[PDB]
Structure formats: C-alpha cells, structure tokens
Design a protein around this ligand. Structure first.
Ligand SMILES: *[C@@H]1O[C@H](CO)[C@@H](O)[C@H](O)[C@H]1NC(C)=O
Ligand SMILES: *[C@@H]1O[C@H](CO)[C@@H](O)[C@H](O)[C@H]1NC(C)=O
Lengths: 52, 52
C-alpha cells in the first residue's frame, strides 16, 4: 500500500477559491460625510425619516 | 408642525397628564367658551387654562 497526491486538481480548485476570495475581501467602499443616526433630543419629523 | 407633535406623542405612547399648580395671580382663570360644550355647559380644552 502507498499514497500519493494529484497536485494539478488541488491547485485548480484552490485557484477558483482564491479568485472568489479576491473578489470579496479586496473591495473598499469610500464614504466621507453622511447623516447622523445618534439623536440627543426628540425632533419629530426629520428624525423619523433619517432613522428609517 | 402638527405632524411632529403627532409623531412624538405617538412614539411616547401615553397621555399621562399630571396636574401641576402654578401662581396665576392677577388673571382670571378657567375661561369657558360657547363652542366647547361639556355637560351642556360652556367650557374649554381640558388641559388648557384660559387667562382673562
Ligand atoms: C405669586 O406672585 C406674587 C407676585 O407679587 C408673589 O408675591 C408670590 O410669592 C407668588 N407666589 C408663588 C407661589 O410663587
Ligand atoms: C376653575 O374652577 C374650579 C371651580 O369651578 C376651581 O379649580 C377654580 O375656580 C378654577 N381653577 C383653578 C385652578 O383655579
């Protein structure tokens, strides 16, 4: 009895996984100035809209 | 800003009114009116005190 590994298939599947990972982790969304979600008081109308 | 009052009152969830004493020295209070009728008597808004 003996054991050996097929390198080509392993690396093909790993390459697919690598491309998937590259398409997810790398991206960065740049956003500077926004609305405020923390409200100190009760302001009625405008608070409800932006919270929604 | 009728909508703002409507909103904040509804969001609170209670009409709990605690009657609070004031000075009102020098002005005639209560101030009934003909339009507001309570128990077939001239009257006014319950939570508001007319100063005459
Ligand atoms: C009400 O106003 C009068 C004005 O002269 C004052 O003397 C009196 O102390 C006041 N009462 C209260 C409870 O603030
Ligand atoms: C309004 O009327 C009642 C008596 O009818 C009495 O409280 C007082 O005369 C007036 N209210 C106040 C808070 O002074």
């Amino acid at each position: 009895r003996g054991q050996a590994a097929d390198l080509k298939s392993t690396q093909a599947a790993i390459d697919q996984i690598n491309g998937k990972l590259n398409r997810l982790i790398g991206k960065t969304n740049e956003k500077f100035h926004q609305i405020e979600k923390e409200f100190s008081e009760v302001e009625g109308r405008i608070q409800d809209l932006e919270k929604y | 800003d009728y909508a703002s009052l409507r909103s904040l009152v509804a969001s609170s969830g209670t009409l709990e009114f605690n009657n609070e004493s004031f000075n009102w020295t020098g002005v005639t209070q209560n101030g009934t009116s003909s339009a507001c009728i309570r128990r077939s008597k001239n009257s006014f808004f319950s939570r508001l005190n007319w100063l005459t």
